Design a protein around this ligand. Structure first.
Ligand SMILES: Nc1ncnc2c1ncn2[C@@H]1O[C@H](COS(=O)(=O)NC(=O)c2csc(-c3nc4ccc(O)cc4s3)n2)[C@@H](O)[C@H]1O
Ligand SMILES: C[C@H](O)CC[C@H](C)O
Ligand SMILES: C[C@H](O)CC[C@H](C)O
Length: 544
């Protein structure tokens, strides 16, 4: 019964607000829409702005239109789109009236899209042009779908209503957005978002997240230590996908704060620096796969970045060395980190403002607790000991949609979620993520972490990107091996790469598995490495 080994989150600076997530969003955005010149979203590519006034008015119109159409808390809508200025209009609209929103990944193949909508069971589908065809090819197998609406069109498009013509079909005469009152409902039992889970074998799952979870996020995002201070005329640059929890709940919190969310979809070094300069960006929110595009640029000094105070990263490991280098080049105290799972709604470990520690992902957020347990007996471990990370609090998902068995396998009766990650916490209660548990390698009954070897590989100059896994061998079970994309203009050989690896490792950690040179390492949208795909590639090196 040792609670000295359970890391607890401090009390929030602000007490948790009442109301549904829709009510808190509506309140904040109405306030900002009544302040002249407030911009909610800016497309940095085409240089188009949308004010909080227009965004509020259109979200309210969508809420009333869906309500008049007949949607209520028994229904769900899908939002299938690349990032854009229109993404959050139907999301906010649905949140205002208690309709659950299921974002479907825009780059899903039709099979994965069918899975997502089979779980969410949407009545109405909001889809960009780029995604329409896939929706159609899937729609035949989901009779629950009664209405398809195009998001990035002003007129009807190819026989489908756009959000504007839909709204016009259902709004009453003389409707005034500022007299609209969002629906009230049980914030613990009404689902706000159904997100799709990642990483795990098999088809993704439906992660049901009630309004309560969004409300706790809205506590965090305006917290002076675990969030961002609400100061007028603040611009954020976001390059994170909106259908994913990392894009969803950061962007929602940014709206709660009245920030200006500046969007890039194609990431290039010079366009990034121009955008930071011209929009006076104070914080850039990134995934680590984008860092290489500017970490060693020579242009940084040619741009005025005096407004830039923060670079935040999330969704996957960020190299300590890359992070320290980038933080020092932009005069930053560090790269701010956030760790979360789709199943925890958002980051439940955040680097607190003013308390950076390089290589860590932060401390436990308010309302949450975290522990590290033994992989074989589940016993809680103590300081600086590695084990599985467990977390519990009011942003844990209510459960997987129609899958109670998976829910109970993930979350125990005390509410602890078993993250699947190896971590530890230090004397000051900072957490470090070591690796994914299902990606450890067994040399001779000793656990080798592929992330450590990757970081070492990544040190090298001739090595642009690396991914490590296990190649199967009847001796040792699996030997550790790599997949290496080299820097342009480099000659490195498998012999001298395994030798450089031997130079900074113990006995079992030696890369006795070889190297398979590649033109790119298989990553995900947030840049998690595809361990199954790396093992797959590690077959040509199994050949003779
Ligand atoms: N920060 C991190 N550092 C190292 N590894 C990280 C990581 N985050 C996720 N991971 C990995 O993603 C897996 C979780 O996978 S997941 O399905 O895709 N869910 C997520 O990745 C997820 C949901 S929310 C969220 C974040 N919200 C934020 C808000 C602010 C901020 O500054 C950073 C973040 S991250 N990330 C983790 O288990 C882990 O392996
Ligand atoms: C306080 C909140 O707005 C109401 C949610 C309860 C559970 O109905
Ligand atoms: C605030 C204004 O919209 C920025 C315009 C320049 C071109 O970025």
């Amino acid at each position: 019964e040792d609670a000295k080994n359970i890391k607890k989150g401090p009390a929030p600076f602000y007490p948790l607000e009442d109301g549904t997530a829709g009510e808190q969003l509506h309140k904040a955005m109405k306030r900002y829409a009544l302040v002249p010149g407030t911009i909610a979203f800016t497309d940095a590519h085409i240089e188009v702005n949308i004010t909080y006034a227009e965004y509020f008015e259109m979200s309210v119109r969508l809420a009333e239109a869906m309500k008049r159409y007949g949607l209520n808390t028994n229904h769900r809508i899908v939002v299938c789109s690349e990032n854009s200025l229109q993404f959050f209009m139907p999301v906010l609209g649905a949140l205002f009236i208690g309709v659950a929103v299921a974002p479907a990944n825009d780059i899903y193949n039709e099979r994965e899209l069918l899975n997502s909508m089979n779980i969410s069971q949407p009545t109405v589908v909001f889809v960009s042009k780029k995604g329409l065809q896939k929706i159609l090819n899937v729609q035949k197998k989901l009779p629950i779908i009664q209405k398809i609406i195009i998001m990035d069109s002003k007129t009807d498009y190819q026989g489908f209503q756009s959000m504007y013509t839909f709204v016009t079909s259902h709004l009453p005469p003389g409707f005034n957005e500022y007299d609209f009152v969002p629906e009230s409902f049980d914030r613990d039992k009404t689902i706000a978002l159904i997100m799709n889970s990642s990483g795990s074998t098999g088809l993704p799952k439906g992660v049901a997240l009630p309004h309560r979870n969004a409300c706790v996020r809205f506590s965090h995002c305006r917290d002076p230590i675990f969030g961002n201070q609400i100061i007028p005329d603040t611009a954020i640059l976001s390059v994170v996908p909106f259908h994913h929890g990392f894009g969803m709940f950061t962007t929602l919190g940014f709206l709660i704060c009245g920030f200006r969310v500046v969007l890039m979809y194609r990431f290039e070094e010079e366009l990034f620096l121009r955008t930071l300069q011209d929009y006076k960006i104070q914080s850039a929110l990134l995934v680590p796969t984008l860092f290489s595009f500017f970490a060693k640029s020579t242009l940084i000094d040619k741009y005025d970045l005096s407004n830039l105070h923060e670079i935040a990263s999330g969704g996957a490991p960020l190299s300590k060395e890359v992070g320290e280098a980038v933080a020092k080049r932009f005069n930053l105290p560090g790269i701010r980190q956030g760790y979360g799972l789709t199943e925890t709604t958002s980051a439940i470990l955040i680097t607190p403002n003013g308390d950076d520690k390089p290589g860590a992902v932060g401390k436990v957020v308010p309302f949450f607790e975290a522990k590290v347990v033994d992989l074989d007996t589940g016993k809680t471990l103590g300081v600086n000991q590695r084990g599985e990370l467990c977390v519990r609090g009011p942003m844990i998902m209510s459960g997987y949609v129609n899958n109670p068995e998976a829910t109970n396998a993930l979350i125990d009766k005390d509410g602890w979620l078993h993250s699947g990650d190896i971590a530890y916490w230090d004397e000051d209660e900072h957490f470090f993520i070591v690796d994914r548990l299902k990606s450890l390698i067994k040399y001779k009954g000793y656990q080798v972490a592929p992330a450590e070897l990757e970081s070492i590989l990544l040190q090298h100059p001739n090595i642009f990107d690396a991914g490590v896994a296990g190649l199967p061998d009847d001796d040792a079970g699996e030997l550790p091996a790599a997949v290496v994309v080299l820097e342009h203009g480099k000659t490195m050989t498998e012999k001298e790469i395994v030798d450089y690896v031997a130079s900074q490792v113990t006995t079992a950690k030696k890369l006795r598995g070889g190297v398979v040179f590649v033109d790119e390492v298989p990553k995900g949208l947030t840049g998690k490495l595809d361990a199954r795909k790396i093992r797959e590639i590690l077959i040509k090196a199994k050949k003779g």
